Amino acid sequence: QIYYSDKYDDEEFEYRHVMLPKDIAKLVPKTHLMSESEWRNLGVQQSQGWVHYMIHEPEPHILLFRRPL
Amino acid sequence: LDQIWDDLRAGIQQVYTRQSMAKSRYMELYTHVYNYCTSVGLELYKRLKEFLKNYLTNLLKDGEDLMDESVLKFYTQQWEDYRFSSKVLNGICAYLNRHWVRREYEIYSLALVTWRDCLFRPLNKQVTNAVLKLIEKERNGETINTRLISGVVQSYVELGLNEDDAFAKGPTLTVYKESFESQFLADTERFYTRESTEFLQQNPVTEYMKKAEARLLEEQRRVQVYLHESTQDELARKCEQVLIEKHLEIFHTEFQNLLDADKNEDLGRMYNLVSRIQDGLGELKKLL
Amino acid sequence: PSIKLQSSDGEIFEVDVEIAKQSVTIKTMLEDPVPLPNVNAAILKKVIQWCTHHKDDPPTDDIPVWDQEFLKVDQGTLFELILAANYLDIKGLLDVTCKTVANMIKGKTPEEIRKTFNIKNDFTEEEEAQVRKENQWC
Amino acid sequence: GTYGVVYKARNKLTGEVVALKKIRLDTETEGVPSTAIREISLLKELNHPNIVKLLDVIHTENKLYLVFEFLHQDLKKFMDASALTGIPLPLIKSYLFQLLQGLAFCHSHRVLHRDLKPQNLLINTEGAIKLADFGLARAFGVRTYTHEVVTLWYRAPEILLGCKYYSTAVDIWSLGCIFAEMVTRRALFPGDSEIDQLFRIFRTLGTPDEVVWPGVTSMPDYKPSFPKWARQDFSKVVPPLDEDGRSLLSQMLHYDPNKRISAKAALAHPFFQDVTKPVPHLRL
Amino acid sequence: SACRNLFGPVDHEELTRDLEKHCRDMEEASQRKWNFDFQNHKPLEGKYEWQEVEKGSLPEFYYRPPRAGSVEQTPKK
Amino acid sequence: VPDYHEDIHTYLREMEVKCKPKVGYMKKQPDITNSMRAILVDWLVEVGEEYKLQNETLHLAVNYIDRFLSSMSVLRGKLQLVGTAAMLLASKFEEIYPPEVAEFVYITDDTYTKKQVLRMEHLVLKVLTFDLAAPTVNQFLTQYFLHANCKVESLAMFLGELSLIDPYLKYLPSVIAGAAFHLALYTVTGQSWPESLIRKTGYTLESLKPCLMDLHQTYLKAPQHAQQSIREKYKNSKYHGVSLLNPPETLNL
Amino acid sequence: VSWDSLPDELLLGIFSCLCLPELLKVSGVCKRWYRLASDESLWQTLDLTGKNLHPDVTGRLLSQGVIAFRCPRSFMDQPLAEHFSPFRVQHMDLSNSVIEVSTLHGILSQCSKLQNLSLEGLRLSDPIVNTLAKNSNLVRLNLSGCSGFSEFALQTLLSSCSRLDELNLSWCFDFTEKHVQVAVAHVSETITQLNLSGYRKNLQKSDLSTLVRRCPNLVHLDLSDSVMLKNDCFQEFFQLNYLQHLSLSRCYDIIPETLLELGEIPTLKTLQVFGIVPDGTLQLLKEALPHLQINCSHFTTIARPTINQEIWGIKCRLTLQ
């Protein structure tokens, strides 16, 4: 269900995005974005330091994280 | 403006010392007030405050300096008339209260504040002393004109200062507590302490108990017809602490001898009295 | 009972006390032929009609259609009517007139608004560019 | 498995290519589909060598028959066959010439395709290529139209950033993507979703900004917290291609729609004015 | 307000007969020029060599349908 | 970009002559009159307004109505179903989210079944032979407006629709469009037909004099006409309420 | 009729029925209307959700008398050039905005009556927090994800602020044992809701003990991703008395079974324990302590202004849709 994406990076940060199924995606808050504890509770599984930093209005079921180098 | 001010002042002179003017005059005054506030009425507010201070000082000059029994029949009348006429005046200048006093002082509250500054005159202690003298008829004498007391009591209740303290909440009895209740309670204690002892030194204790109960019921009734309701508890506590709670040893002796006597009824009244006070029955049960 | 309300020119319209009670000023005056030298009969009759229509109220933003058609009248009377409502200090009537004027201003440009309201523009031709510069972020 | 039935006819004709198409019509659901009506009305009005021709319309009680024009091979399978060999440059130039001619005609006649992709381009055994799939056509006079276009692989930054007017410059973007794709046998922008698509476009052509794209910051779905990438050298993006073709691609995948060349303007390129007409080398 | 009539209901089976007699015009010309049984999805004697070409030959467009431990790190998939 | 504007203009000028219906067709109908089609088109504009559709839908619907009646006769009761089918066709061709057949078989007060609507749908497709991309005036007006304030356009479309209410069918849609544009421009601000239009479309004022005076006189007679649904609809502020202005009594041509 | 004869109160009454674009539009009519377009009574509650803008524009707007200034996820990466007076804003929301350190320092060196705040996701610094120390009236606060300040600055801030009702010092990715120590040492005594998650190898036993023996009024607590919490921590919570909402999610050093003891605290209502409890055993926990709610609120609530466009129950009237 949870589909991850490859790492694409610029000269200073390094990124990733993650898709969600319908049941999980129905949970995301549309007012404030999240924090590491929040999305780990959601059910994401990855390293330490990734920061949720954007919401895309047309498609809410996609999350965008980043973490510095 | 100026031309408005003369007629307005004359009209306000008319509203005080009321002669029940006609609604045409009142609409003329209201229209003047509304007209000036459309062209921002700080200046008119200042003039109103000035005029009230002047008039009330002049009224104080006369009628004062009586010291008893006539400071009341003067003060209650003046307070009543001034309150009514000031209420009407607040009615007239109602346009200020909506559009300039809202950016901060209502006219009625200003009038009450000025009358309060008339209260902090010898007119404060004199009237209280005279009321105490009149209620010195706690002994007897159906000459207590309750309309000469309830007016002052209500005035003391009302004048609780409110000028932007927080807001109009409800009962503001600060002035009542700090300028009338204390003296009343102290005098009550003093008089009862004197009379109870002098009566004890001449009579058997049964009549003392009867008189104590009678005075208790009388002083519970008295508050319901004279004073503000937030007074019953403290007065009851003090009158109990004076009429009883300070002759318990005499109570013990009479308790012993009434057990030597054959009265089961002073039993009941004694029980009611001692129950009115704390922890009495233990000494009653123990010698029992 | 009833009260004899006299306009600025004698058009005495006898009106129920419970109807005139709607106006706060008259309410407080009655609390303790009455001329109202700031209202003529033309406005007074319409005010009485409106009050009688709202006499039994409980006591955008969903303007009632009765008032709306009652307000479907030209400019000068609207101006005089707002002033009369302020002078007598009636809440709902002043509110609805203000709301109608607001909705009627909606849509037009500064030129059109300035034209329709007979507003005398001033301090212009050199600073309006600056004031619009203050408002790009709109 | 792989259900369907087709029919042909080869009796006496030079342009003897025919094929029958039947489209189901459910009796009581919206009736005739809007796509069918748009297709038929916009198709029986155009005629051109680089466009599939319609010959007749047959309307039964519950089915529709369209006598299209048969043709041999599309582009996806043709590139898949030559996926390791590459495509001859003159053949590419001829294909691009025919595509540009067809686009010029369609846009002159007020018709928008909006659905161009290699899967809808049909080639003949003589080098001639023609368009198809006019079910998404619409007659534009520019208003605000429908907000669903070709495919996430071939959309344009006009639609992805949710613009309101998408007048006839999106087909140019799709054509450019197809051209670079067949040149390198790789789709330039293999998006997973819209965000992956935008991030890939940025990675290839650098982050847009007011200098590059005027009025980009005010688009409904722009957020300047995007990654700050730089426009890579356009060379290694399209290695096997010369300088003049690079110029044409650079001025045919430009961000701003106004600064994006049209069809007839593109017909006059040097790179392009050199014109051949070979034939396909493999079976069709 | 827009819910209005103009003339009341009118006869209908005459409409059905009229429209179906209308539709009997693409029955002689259809057989003539295209020599195919369109109404029955059947081919005919000829003049148009009818075959059933296999699906992999012609491009797909001609038949396309319409529309303690448990540490905090990354576990690869 | 003007890279295609003149080409599209020329192409439309070419198309408009192929789809022009017959003028004297109306008498051929045994039991229908021009007044009756006027009532039908009035109902039509009412429907088009209340469903919140576009006016180009109305123009295409009336064009299909004309090319159908001018090429086929029918008894009295069927004009309503014909109009509904024309609405369906125009909406599906043009408008983004077309209303369903249920709404149309409802707005006729449930007087006809869905299947008859489908059958006459087949019929109208048959007689038209799937030729629905016809040109109409609004495209010409929108092209003209490029060479101006919103009131001008509101009045222009007003005059055009008043024309399509019912003697104008002699003139081509470009002709009516030009005459309405000139008259509305004069009425709103007195400006005259610019030279660039004469360069582009080739029309001059003299060539459009008859339709221009017809539009003037019918504009005068319109406020007292028996039907004013268009008038009350353009009373709305969306169109700047411009249906209430005065029809000029004499022009300065 | 000359409508320029209207009184100011009626003109304000008229203006108070508009929407922000039109109120901006009417400002350009005549000098009097220009005055009345900014009269500190229409500008109570503003809103600039995500709308890009510029520091001087926002400074002028705040100086006009804003109270409830809501501006989440808007970008201001440009220098601030003008001086102002001390502002009057009370409920300032700036979460997630891409803003510059110098600009944020400039804008915060003016506000001093801040009754509430939120600085989620931003990056702060020593002058930032030093200036922020002046707000001796902060009912709430938030610093989630922020990073950069130092121990001395943190202790000065927390000592200066006393009335602080709820704190959320979460997930900062540059703290150390020193930072968390000074936080728990100098936190105020009124804290109703507190969150200190994230600090995996920095939250230690003595720290939690000091916290619980200092602040007795914690109603909502959470210590997620703390890996050094044990049984004695559980009894530390038993010394607490009003803990209605706990969450020890992903606390890896804890057996699932000792959690049954937690229900013995009387006033508990919720417990979010994601990560430790394996599947199936959740039913075991529920049946073991069925007087609670386990794993039912995925998202925090500690000083998050919005959870619906209303900031902290306050509704904004001037808006941009």
* Nearest-5° Cα angle at G226, G220 to G229: 85
CATH class of the D73-274 domain in this structure = mainly alpha
Q: How far is E69 from chain A (nearest CA, A)?
A: 14
User: How far apart (Å, rounded) are the C-alpha atoms in residues C36 and C9?
Assistant: 9
Answer yes or no: do B118 and B1 share one domain: yes
CA-based diameter of chain C, in Å?
Answer: 63
Asked if residues G219 and G241 have their Cβ atoms less than 8 Å apart, the reply is no
Which chain C residue has its CA at the smallest distance from G60's CA? C134
For the record, the structure tokens of C80 come out as 């005089």
Going by C-beta distance under 8 Å and a sequence separation of 6 or more, which residues neighbour residue D3? none
User: How far apart (Å, rounded) are the C-alpha atoms in residues F88 and D135?
Assistant: 18
- Whether C38 and B31 lie within 8 Å, measured CB to CB: yes
Mutate to test the interface with A, among D147, D159, D193 (most CBs of A within 10 A): D193
CA-based diameter of chain A, in Å?
Answer: 36
Give the domain ranges of chain D: 73-274
Asked if residues G112 and G135 have their Cβ atoms less than 8 Å apart, the reply is yes
H-helix or E-strand spanning residue E23? helix E13-23
* Helices (H) then strands (E): counts for chain G: 11, 7
Q: Which residues pair with C16 in a beta bridge?
A: C2
Check if A37 contacts E (Cβ < 8 Å).
Answer: no
Which of G313, G255, G320, G265 lies closest to G289, judged by CA? G265
* Nearest-5° Cα angle at F208, F206 to F213: 100
User: How far apart (Å, rounded) are the C-alpha atoms in residues F199 and G40?
Assistant: 58
CA atoms within 13 A on the CB side of F72: 18
CB contacts of E68 in chain G (<8 Å) are 252-253
Mutate to test the interface with F, among D41, D60, D149, D256 (most CBs of F within 10 A): D41
CB nearest D45 (choices: F101, F122, F133)? F133
Number of domains forming the structure of chain C: 1
Going by C-beta distance under 8 Å and a sequence separation of 6 or more, which residues neighbour residue B203? none
Q: How far is G214 from chain B (nearest CA, A)?
A: 35
Check if B40 contacts G (Cβ < 8 Å).
Answer: yes
Query: By residue range, what is the domain housing residue B238?
Result: 125-247
Q: How large is the angle between the packed helices B71-92 and B125-135, nearest 10 degrees?
A: 130
* Nearest-5° Cα angle at B217, B215 to B219: 65
User: How far apart (Å, rounded) are the C-alpha atoms in residues C44 and C23?
Assistant: 12
In D48-87, the residues whose Cβ lies within 8 Å of chain E are 56, 58-61, 63, 65, 67-68, 70-74, 77
Q: Catalytic residue among D80, D115, D221, D256, which?
A: D115
Check if D146 contacts E (Cβ < 8 Å).
Answer: no
D120 is in an annotated binding site: yes
D176 is in an annotated binding site: no
User: How far apart (Å, rounded) are the C-alpha atoms in residues D38 and D52?
Assistant: 16
User: How far apart (Å, rounded) are the C-alpha atoms in residues D108 and D185?
Assistant: 31
Q: How far is B103 from chain G (nearest CA, A)?
A: 11
Q: How far is D197 from chain A (nearest CA, A)?
A: 12
CB contacts of D37 in chain F (<8 Å) are 89, 92-93, 130, 132
The technique is cryo-EM
CA distances for B280 relative to A39, B189, B206, B209, B211, angstroms: 70, 21, 18, 16, 20
Asked if residues D36 and D28 have their Cβ atoms less than 8 Å apart, the reply is no
Which chain F residue has its CA at the smallest distance from E26's CA? F126
Check if C106 contacts G (Cβ < 8 Å).
Answer: yes
Check if C94 contacts G (Cβ < 8 Å).
Answer: yes
CB nearest E68 (choices: G200, G253, G275)? G253
Q: How far is E55 from chain D (nearest CA, A)?
A: 8
CB contacts of D9 in chain E (<8 Å) are 48-50
Which chain F residue has its CA at the smallest distance from E15's CA? F116
User: How far apart (Å, rounded) are the C-alpha atoms in residues G95 and G90?
Assistant: 15
State the first-to-last Cα distance of chain C, in angstroms, to the nearest integer: 56
CB contacts of G304 in chain A (<8 Å) are 32
Which of D199, D175, D173 lies closest to D253, judged by CA? D173
For the record, the structure tokens of G274 come out as 């994601």
Answer yes or no: do B241 and B163 share one domain: yes
CA B119 to chain CA centroid, Å, is: 13
Q: Which residues pair with A19 in a beta bridge?
A: A62
User: How far apart (Å, rounded) are the C-alpha atoms in residues F122 and D31?
Assistant: 9
Q: Which residues pair with D22 in a beta bridge?
A: D65
CA distances for C123 relative to C112, D88, D171, angstroms: 18, 72, 52
Give me Rg for the CA atoms of chain F.
Answer: 18
CB contacts of B39 in chain G (<8 Å) are 7
CB contacts of F79 in chain E (<8 Å) are 6
Coil, strand or helix: which one is F166?
coil
H helix runs in F16-113, sequence order: 25-28, 34-50, 55-69, 79-94, 101-107
User: How far apart (Å, rounded) are the C-alpha atoms in residues D240 and E39?
Assistant: 54
User: How far apart (Å, rounded) are the C-alpha atoms in residues G116 and G142?
Assistant: 9
D66 is in an annotated binding site: no
H-helix or E-strand spanning residue C91? helix C91-105
Cα dihedral D118, D120, D123, D128 sign:
negative
Coil, strand or helix: which one is E17?
helix
Asked if residues F141 and F124 have their Cβ atoms less than 8 Å apart, the reply is no
Answer yes or no: do B199 and B215 share one domain: yes
CA distances for F182 relative to C122, F157, F171, F186, F206, angstroms: 37, 12, 15, 6, 12
Q: How far is E57 from chain F (nearest CA, A)?
A: 31
User: How far apart (Å, rounded) are the C-alpha atoms in residues B41 and D150?
Assistant: 70
Coil, strand or helix: which one is A14?
strand
Number of domains forming the structure of chain A: 1
Chains B and E make contact, 3+ CB pairs within 8 Å: no
For the record, the structure tokens of C55 come out as 């006499």
Q: What CATH number is attached to the domain comprising B96?
A: 1.20.1310.10
D115 is catalytic: yes
For the record, the structure tokens of G52 come out as 């890009």
Query: By residue range, what is the domain housing residue C73?
Result: 1-138
For the record, the structure tokens of B137 come out as 């008829």
User: How far apart (Å, rounded) are the C-alpha atoms in residues E76 and A16?
Assistant: 13
SS (H, E, C) B134-187: HHHHHCCCCCCCCHHHHHHHHHHHHCCCCCCCCCCCCCCCHHHHHHHHHHHHHH
Check if F114 contacts E (Cβ < 8 Å).
Answer: no
Coil, strand or helix: which one is G246?
strand
CB nearest D58 (choices: E23, E38, E60)? E38
User: DSSP string of G110-151?
Assistant: T----SB---TT----HHHHHHHTT-TT-SB---TT-----H
DSSP structural state of residue F172: -
Residue F4 corresponds to which amino acid? Y
Going by C-beta distance under 8 Å and a sequence separation of 6 or more, which residues neighbour residue F148? none
- Whether G98 and D225 lie within 8 Å, measured CB to CB: yes
Bridge-based pairing of strands G220-222 and G193-195 is: parallel
- Whether B91 and C37 lie within 8 Å, measured CB to CB: no
Asked if residues G240 and G194 have their Cβ atoms less than 8 Å apart, the reply is no
Answer yes or no: do B103 and B204 share one domain: no
B247-253 contact pairs (CB < 8 A, 24+): B247/B196, B247/B200, B248/B280, B248/B283, B250/B200, B250/B205, B251/B205, B252/B283, B252/B287
Q: Which chains touch E (3 or more CB pairs under 8 A)?
A: A, D, F, G
Asked if residues G2 and G301 have their Cβ atoms less than 8 Å apart, the reply is no
CB contacts of F233 in chain E (<8 Å) are none
Task: Say if residue G319 is exposed, middle or buried (CB neighbours under 10 Å; 0-12, 13-18, 19+).
Answer: middle
Backbone angles phi, psi at G221, to 5 degrees: -135, 160
- Whether D61 and E39 lie within 8 Å, measured CB to CB: yes
CA atoms within 13 A on the CB side of G315: 2
Q: How far is C44 from chain G (nearest CA, A)?
A: 20
CB nearest B88 (choices: C32, C34, C89)? C32
Q: Which residues of F202-233 are buried (b: 16+ CB within 10 A; e: fewer)?
A: ebeeeebeebbebbbebbeebeeeebebbeeb
Query: By residue range, what is the domain housing residue A11?
Result: 1-69
Residue A49 corresponds to which amino acid? G
CB contacts of D225 in chain A (<8 Å) are 53-54
